[PDB]
Amino acid sequence: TPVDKTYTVGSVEFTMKGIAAVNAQLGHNDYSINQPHTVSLSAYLIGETEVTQELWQAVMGNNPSHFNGSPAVGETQGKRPVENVNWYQAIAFCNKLSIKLNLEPCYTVNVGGNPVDFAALSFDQIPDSNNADWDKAELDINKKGFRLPTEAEWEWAAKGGTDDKWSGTNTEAELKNYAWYGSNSGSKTHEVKKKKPNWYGLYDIAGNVAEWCWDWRADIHTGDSFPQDYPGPASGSGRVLRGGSWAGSADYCAVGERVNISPGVRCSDLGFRLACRP
Ligand SMILES: [Ca+2]
Ligand code: NA
């Protein structure tokens, strides 16, 4: 298992949690579009928490979050997850974070044939609608920088070494102890790391905000096989997001429940969690 790592951007600290190489047993018979399948995964790290508003702002110099004020009693505003960021804006953050921390960026984007310099890139230059150039973003998974997890990486980490329906529990009854979801959120996001973690030490895998993943969505059917470190299909209409949110039913927060939307779309219940490799 890779050693956990804590990084600092200005005054903001964040932790990446080690996940051992594994033949990940993913999906479930009860999900027609996420049938049981195996993906061999290389060792990786995944964010202990969602990317918070203060981490987002430390890198990006703005805060587009819908819930940018009025935190719940006893909660710190800046430690709520960032949300209202689209998939393009998330990958741009990942590259800018890598650059700030002197790691090689995982992502390349060419705009009209010109490679995007992610250091120079201003926020307003990132698309807020479906954009063909950014849809062709290239992932080099062997660079040491930060990135979105693949869907397989996300689900394996979410499962936390167990076979439970949710991250940390197998009943909706106990879900309140692990997740901020439709029933207990009060219609808002919460400070990260306020509920129980899973056995891999990840917080808010279920609930709070859904989390952008790298992959285009394609249905995963009975008997399907996948290559090592599968990053999803080459094309699709929606990028995957996982884990459910403050707005979702308990079932929406299940570890195996697959959701996807146009990458240009952003909402108040959708943020992201980082991944990288040692
Ligand atoms: Ca979440
Ligand atoms: Na499952």
UniProtKB/TrEMBL annotation:
<protein>
    <recommendedName>
        <fullName>Sulfatase-modifying factor enzyme-like domain-containing protein</fullName>
    </recommendedName>
</protein>
<keyword id="KW-0732">Signal</keyword>
<feature type="binding site">
    <location>
        <position position="211"/>
    </location>
    <ligand>
        <name>Ca(2+)</name>
    </ligand>
</feature>
<feature type="binding site">
    <location>
        <position position="204"/>
    </location>
    <ligand>
        <name>Ca(2+)</name>
    </ligand>
</feature>
<dbReference type="GO" id="GO:0120147">
    <property type="term" value="F:formylglycine-generating oxidase activity"/>
</dbReference>
<keyword id="KW-0479">Metal-binding</keyword>
<feature type="binding site">
    <location>
        <position position="50"/>
    </location>
    <ligand>
        <name>Ca(2+)</name>
    </ligand>
</feature>
<feature type="domain" description="Sulfatase-modifying factor enzyme-like">
    <location>
        <begin position="32"/>
        <end position="275"/>
    </location>
</feature>
<feature type="binding site">
    <location>
        <position position="207"/>
    </location>
    <ligand>
        <name>Ca(2+)</name>
    </ligand>
</feature>
<dbReference type="GO" id="GO:0046872">
    <property type="term" value="F:metal ion binding"/>
</dbReference>
<feature type="binding site">
    <location>
        <position position="209"/>
    </location>
    <ligand>
        <name>Ca(2+)</name>
    </ligand>
</feature>
<keyword id="KW-0106">Calcium</keyword>
